[PDB]
Amino acid sequence: AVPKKRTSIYKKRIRKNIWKKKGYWAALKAFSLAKSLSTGNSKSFFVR
Amino acid sequence: MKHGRKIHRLSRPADQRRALLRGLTTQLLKHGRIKTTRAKASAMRKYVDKMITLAKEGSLHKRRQALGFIYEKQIVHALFAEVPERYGDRNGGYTRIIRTLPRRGDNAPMAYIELV
Amino acid sequence: MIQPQTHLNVADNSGARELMCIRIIGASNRRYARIGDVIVAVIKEAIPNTPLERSEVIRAVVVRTCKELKRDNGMIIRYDDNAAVIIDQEGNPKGTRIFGAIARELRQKFAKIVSLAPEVL
Amino acid sequence: RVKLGDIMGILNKKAVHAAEELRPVPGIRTGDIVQIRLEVPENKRRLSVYKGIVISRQNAGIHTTIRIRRIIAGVGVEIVFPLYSPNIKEIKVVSHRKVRKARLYYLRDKLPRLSTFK
Amino acid sequence: SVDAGIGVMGTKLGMMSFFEEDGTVVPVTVIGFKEGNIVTQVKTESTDGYNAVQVGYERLRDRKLTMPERGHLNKAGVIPMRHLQEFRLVSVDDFTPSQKLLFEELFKEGDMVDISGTTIGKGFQGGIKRHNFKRGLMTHGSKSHRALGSIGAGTTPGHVYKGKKMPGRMGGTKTKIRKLKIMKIDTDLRVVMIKGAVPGKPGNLLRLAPAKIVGKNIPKN
RNA sequence: AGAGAAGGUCACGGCGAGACGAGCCGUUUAUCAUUACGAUAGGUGUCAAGUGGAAGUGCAGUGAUGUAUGCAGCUGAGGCAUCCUAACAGACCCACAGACUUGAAC
RNA sequence: CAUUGAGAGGACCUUUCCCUAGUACGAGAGGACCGGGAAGGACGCACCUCUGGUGUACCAGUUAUCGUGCCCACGGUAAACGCUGGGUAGCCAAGUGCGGAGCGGAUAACUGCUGAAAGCAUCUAAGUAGUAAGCCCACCCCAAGAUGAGUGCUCUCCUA
RNA sequence: UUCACAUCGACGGGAAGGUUUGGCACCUCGAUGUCGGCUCUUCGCCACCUGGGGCUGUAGUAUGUUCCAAGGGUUGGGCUG
RNA sequence: GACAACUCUCUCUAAGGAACUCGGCAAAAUAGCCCCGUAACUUCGGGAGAAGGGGUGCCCCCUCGGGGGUCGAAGU
Ligand SMILES: [Mg+2]
Ligand SMILES: [Mg+2]
Ligand SMILES: [Mg+2]
Ligand SMILES: [Mg+2]
Ligand SMILES: [Mg+2]
Ligand SMILES: [Mg+2]
Ligand SMILES: [Mg+2]
Ligand SMILES: [Mg+2]
Ligand SMILES: [Mg+2]
Ligand SMILES: [Mg+2]
Ligand SMILES: [Mg+2]
Ligand SMILES: [Mg+2]
Ligand SMILES: [Mg+2]
Ligand SMILES: [Mg+2]
Ligand SMILES: [Mg+2]
Ligand SMILES: [Mg+2]
Ligand SMILES: [Mg+2]
Ligand SMILES: [Mg+2]
Ligand SMILES: [Mg+2]
Ligand SMILES: [Mg+2]
Ligand SMILES: [Mg+2]
Ligand SMILES: [Mg+2]
Ligand SMILES: [Mg+2]
Ligand SMILES: [Mg+2]
Ligand SMILES: [Mg+2]
Ligand SMILES: [Mg+2]
Ligand SMILES: [Mg+2]
Ligand SMILES: [Mg+2]
Ligand SMILES: [Mg+2]
Ligand SMILES: [Mg+2]
Ligand SMILES: [Mg+2]
Ligand SMILES: [Mg+2]
Ligand SMILES: [Mg+2]
Ligand SMILES: [Mg+2]
Ligand SMILES: [Mg+2]
Ligand SMILES: [Mg+2]
Ligand SMILES: [Mg+2]
Ligand SMILES: [Mg+2]
Ligand SMILES: [Mg+2]
Ligand SMILES: [Mg+2]
Ligand SMILES: [Mg+2]
Ligand SMILES: [Mg+2]
Ligand SMILES: [Mg+2]
Ligand SMILES: [Mg+2]
Ligand SMILES: [Mg+2]
Ligand SMILES: [Mg+2]
Ligand SMILES: [Mg+2]
Ligand SMILES: [Mg+2]
Ligand SMILES: [Mg+2]
Ligand SMILES: [Mg+2]
Ligand SMILES: [Mg+2]
Ligand SMILES: [Mg+2]
Ligand SMILES: [Mg+2]
Ligand SMILES: [Mg+2]
Ligand SMILES: [Mg+2]
Ligand SMILES: [Mg+2]
Ligand SMILES: [Mg+2]
Ligand SMILES: [Mg+2]
Ligand SMILES: [Mg+2]
Ligand SMILES: [Mg+2]
Ligand SMILES: [Mg+2]
Ligand SMILES: [Mg+2]
Ligand SMILES: [Mg+2]
Ligand SMILES: [Mg+2]
Ligand SMILES: [Mg+2]
Ligand SMILES: [Mg+2]
Ligand SMILES: [Mg+2]
Ligand SMILES: [Mg+2]
Ligand SMILES: [Mg+2]
Ligand SMILES: [Mg+2]
Ligand SMILES: [Mg+2]
Ligand SMILES: [Mg+2]
Ligand SMILES: [Mg+2]
Ligand SMILES: [Mg+2]
Ligand SMILES: [Mg+2]
Ligand SMILES: [Mg+2]
Ligand SMILES: [Mg+2]
Ligand SMILES: [Mg+2]
Ligand SMILES: [Mg+2]
Ligand SMILES: [Mg+2]
Ligand SMILES: [Mg+2]
Ligand SMILES: [Mg+2]
Ligand SMILES: [Mg+2]
Ligand SMILES: [Mg+2]
Ligand SMILES: [Mg+2]
Ligand SMILES: [Mg+2]
Ligand SMILES: [Mg+2]
Ligand SMILES: [Mg+2]
Ligand SMILES: [Mg+2]
Ligand SMILES: [Mg+2]
Ligand SMILES: [Mg+2]
Ligand SMILES: [Mg+2]
Ligand SMILES: [Mg+2]
Ligand SMILES: [Mg+2]
Ligand SMILES: [Mg+2]
């Protein structure tokens, strides 16, 4: 099965934005994690 | 599906997964702490403890059971030596699991399994 | 679990050694002969010089299965072979003397057959 | 006061003690030759006598079960008995056979000879 | 769906076998109970538009509850409770908030019940398992096997129909089981044994009502 | 603008929920003294259950092998106990008394 | 949090046998309508107590062979079980339960009652009565994105 | 048997359908392709069975024919492209 | 990592046993060795490993194959 047409500039821009939104949740996990390791109180976590 | 299938597959077939787990335990009992992947660690808990509980009784029977799990004799004998001393009062729970920054190459979540 | 093409041992005198079930009757469209159902069989192997010729279409009731019958005692029965007894459309067995065990599950529709039994289960 | 998993196990213990009170049940393993007497809901006069070897024993609760094989008129018959059943009257061990398995399912494939009793 | 009679909620504990004097073995589900089955709220036709009674079931620590809900159960003057549910009656005069239900009062022996529960989730399931599609040939040349088949007609209509049966997620839903029977009630363990199977695995949550019979327990229309 | 409402998401331990999201349950593990509600997973202890009689040492035997110690040994995805390990540390979103008009009430 | 239900769907299926009664009917042979009761089929919804299937979680035998110094005893390999014999939990059916209720509403054909236009007649023009596995509600899941976005209970809106 | 119209209905006529065998060549030629099975639907009614009826040359059982009715059903094999 | 549908490479499957299908296609079954036995037909060479049957592990004892024991559900 192929693409009978070519995908319109704007619609593609939306699909790719969706795929870029995942970076946003990973940025929240990353931020929360740094704020954890930045109090040095976690015994479950370790860094070297 | 799996409902109440509890085993850790580690994304390997039966043979390999066995051999892997045996290996990882002779490693943990040799070095006392190691760095692995979160799944491997969690899976390895059970077998670590099987070995320790094994050594706590000390019978020739048990010693032959452990010998036939761990790969290296020397580590087994040392186990049966140390364990009554070190773990005698501890009822269960012989391992600590401390997670770390994920790996660079694949971003697989890592971990530190400690003999506690 | 007798179904079409199944082969069956004959449990009586009537002069057939083996039946091949082709149908199940009174069960509407069910495909399973279980104990005490009337099946239409044909005769494959026969006992020579007897009223019954091979390649005959006949009726039989199923007295033995390798599947398991459940009574209400929680009691269960499993034979080692499949067997049926050759009958009339009246419920009377064509042959006059029966082999093997049977069950009290057949007592309702067939009197004759439970009568002639060497054993009842 | 009873926690719930407890309830599940407990109801089986209750039913089996209440059943072993009326009618004490023998120690019965695999490979035992056994005689059983059933009270049938019809035919009050005589109680049906089943003999035979025990091919298997499945342990569950009150519904714990016994499988009896015997050759009858040259046709092999296996029969399954709920042990704590009210419709059973007497059960006893006639003799013991020496067997190495937990279930003898291999008796089907063997000769009639081994299934022959009485 | 106006319901005949107040129901109660219970918890499936699993199944066992249960004898009768004559040696009839009946498989029964054992339905346990927990502290609860307390009428929470009552709804008048005037106020709410209809007649119903909300019974809470499973008790609980107060922390785990949310402030809106805790404040719902202090208006009632009842203990903290996990699951609330409603029963729809045609007459509610007999019920006050804080009043308690006993299942020994509502259910006798040999009575008919209706067990509503949530089903075992089997996940995302194929066409076979979900709708009982006959599978296609396993061997001579055939490349299909467990596949869905053709899904519609040709050029006309030229689109698949609505609700045409397809692989999707199966199980995990509210399911009624009509007209069961109650074999025995144990006051000692406060348990109810029921002939037959009820949905979902032990530790489930069940809702039992006196069975609706479309002629005789219900509004005619 | 400071702060973090009720609540949510995340994180963390999980599942009879699950392709992923979602769902549901947990997150210091109570106290009790008369009920229940404060053990999520793993481990450990015990029990159901399975398999079917461990290893070692005895005896019998020329020996293969049998027999005793012993419903043994192993297993225990299931129950019940017990905080021994991990539920640490935490992060993010989020708080114009609810535009405007008209009647009714006071 | 709990729900109302516009709308949408699933399912409302069918066979033998037994009472009625060997009664009506007929010279006999044959043999009922109507209404009750059981067992079946197919289909649907669940389920694992039993009977099982699998169960590369486990347990046992056993061949070849290489390891653990050697006997003993275990380990590996014989693809993704070396080959066999068992199996719990799970999932599953051939196993187990349950379902198809309505002296509810309105009709199609048809049978009807009062009864004119045509002082007679006529089920129809007024008005009304029975009556179908059909139609619609009731049953079972979904469902306020039902933008017509519903109702109900409770909670919260700090500081300067 | 009597009786055209229970059931048939000769000689002829008036129609509907668009499922057979055809006429046409409006259609597509580049890679818009015929008959059977499998799986999976779905709809029509000219109703095979199941629900209700009228007539019978319907005593009864069973038919015949026709009316309303498409909710549900419509087996398994030996044989054929 | 997780352990959905589905496709592929594989193991197993209660009762039945070709009912499948264009067609037993694919699977399953058989199998080594020693011993007994071996048809129509024939160009007398064959057919023929026809078919069909039995035995087989591990120990001791005898003769240089025979007897006795012993495990296993099953011994190439
Ligand atoms: Mg291997
Ligand atoms: Mg490999
Ligand atoms: Mg364990
Ligand atoms: Mg012939
Ligand atoms: Mg005699
Ligand atoms: Mg069992
Ligand atoms: Mg022996
Ligand atoms: Mg699930
Ligand atoms: Mg098929
Ligand atoms: Mg294929
Ligand atoms: Mg279009
Ligand atoms: Mg807050
Ligand atoms: Mg999580
Ligand atoms: Mg979430
Ligand atoms: Mg915390
Ligand atoms: Mg635990
Ligand atoms: Mg647990
Ligand atoms: Mg020993
Ligand atoms: Mg061993
Ligand atoms: Mg000796
Ligand atoms: Mg045991
Ligand atoms: Mg405690
Ligand atoms: Mg801790
Ligand atoms: Mg205002
Ligand atoms: Mg204003
Ligand atoms: Mg809630
Ligand atoms: Mg609702
Ligand atoms: Mg509606
Ligand atoms: Mg809509
Ligand atoms: Mg509807
Ligand atoms: Mg209806
Ligand atoms: Mg008469
Ligand atoms: Mg009737
Ligand atoms: Mg029925
Ligand atoms: Mg089961
Ligand atoms: Mg079970
Ligand atoms: Mg098996
Ligand atoms: Mg099982
Ligand atoms: Mg060596
Ligand atoms: Mg060696
Ligand atoms: Mg090995
Ligand atoms: Mg190697
Ligand atoms: Mg190789
Ligand atoms: Mg292989
Ligand atoms: Mg196996
Ligand atoms: Mg059923
Ligand atoms: Mg009506
Ligand atoms: Mg009318
Ligand atoms: Mg009329
Ligand atoms: Mg008049
Ligand atoms: Mg009139
Ligand atoms: Mg009118
Ligand atoms: Mg109707
Ligand atoms: Mg009906
Ligand atoms: Mg809303
Ligand atoms: Mg608006
Ligand atoms: Mg409005
Ligand atoms: Mg005319
Ligand atoms: Mg042209
Ligand atoms: Mg094209
Ligand atoms: Mg018509
Ligand atoms: Mg009709
Ligand atoms: Mg008619
Ligand atoms: Mg007549
Ligand atoms: Mg129809
Ligand atoms: Mg239709
Ligand atoms: Mg049709
Ligand atoms: Mg046909
Ligand atoms: Mg995979
Ligand atoms: Mg099979
Ligand atoms: Mg078989
Ligand atoms: Mg077989
Ligand atoms: Mg055969
Ligand atoms: Mg043929
Ligand atoms: Mg064929
Ligand atoms: Mg065919
Ligand atoms: Mg081939
Ligand atoms: Mg092969
Ligand atoms: Mg095989
Ligand atoms: Mg051989
Ligand atoms: Mg072989
Ligand atoms: Mg010769
Ligand atoms: Mg010759
Ligand atoms: Mg020759
Ligand atoms: Mg030839
Ligand atoms: Mg030769
Ligand atoms: Mg040969
Ligand atoms: Mg030849
Ligand atoms: Mg041979
Ligand atoms: Mg042989
Ligand atoms: Mg031998
Ligand atoms: Mg000897
Ligand atoms: Mg010998
Ligand atoms: Mg032997
Ligand atoms: Mg032998």
PDB file of C-alpha atoms (C1' of nucleotides) in Angstrom, chain D residues 1 3 5-6 29 57-59 98-103, chain F residues 32 34-35 49-53 66-67 71 79-81:
ATOM      1  CA  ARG D   1     -12.908 -12.217  62.961  1.00  0.00           C
ATOM      2  CA  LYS D   3      -9.646 -13.040  57.337  1.00  0.00           C
ATOM      3  CA  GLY D   5      -8.139 -16.451  52.405  1.00  0.00           C
ATOM      4  CA  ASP D   6      -8.457 -18.155  55.732  1.00  0.00           C
ATOM      5  CA  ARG D  29      -2.435 -44.172  48.307  1.00  0.00           C
ATOM      6  CA  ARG D  57      -5.329 -39.940  43.925  1.00  0.00           C
ATOM      7  CA  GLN D  58      -6.046 -36.255  43.444  1.00  0.00           C
ATOM      8  CA  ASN D  59      -6.070 -34.241  46.647  1.00  0.00           C
ATOM      9  CA  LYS D  98       4.384 -51.957  44.913  1.00  0.00           C
ATOM     10  CA  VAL D  99       4.505 -49.016  42.493  1.00  0.00           C
ATOM     11  CA  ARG D 100       6.928 -46.260  41.688  1.00  0.00           C
ATOM     12  CA  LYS D 101       4.680 -43.573  40.237  1.00  0.00           C
ATOM     13  CA  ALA D 102       2.173 -41.034  41.438  1.00  0.00           C
ATOM     14  CA  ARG D 103      -0.317 -42.048  38.803  1.00  0.00           C
TER      15      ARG D 103
ATOM     16  C1'   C F  32      -5.803  -2.006  69.463  1.00  0.00           C
ATOM     17  C1'   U F  34     -14.098  -6.337  71.994  1.00  0.00           C
ATOM     18  C1'   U F  35     -14.560  -7.464  65.544  1.00  0.00           C
ATOM     19  C1'   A F  49      -0.401 -28.785  46.481  1.00  0.00           C
ATOM     20  C1'   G F  50       3.059 -31.675  43.159  1.00  0.00           C
ATOM     21  C1'   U F  51       6.349 -35.281  42.492  1.00  0.00           C
ATOM     22  C1'   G F  52       7.073 -40.303  44.636  1.00  0.00           C
ATOM     23  C1'   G F  53      10.929 -42.226  48.580  1.00  0.00           C
ATOM     24  C1'   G F  66      17.140 -54.407  47.327  1.00  0.00           C
ATOM     25  C1'   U F  67      15.976 -52.870  52.267  1.00  0.00           C
ATOM     26  C1'   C F  71       4.536 -39.165  53.602  1.00  0.00           C
ATOM     27  C1'   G F  79      -2.762 -19.276  50.823  1.00  0.00           C
ATOM     28  C1'   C F  80      -1.426 -17.211  55.969  1.00  0.00           C
ATOM     29  C1'   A F  81       2.111 -14.896  59.066  1.00  0.00           C
TER      30        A F  81
END
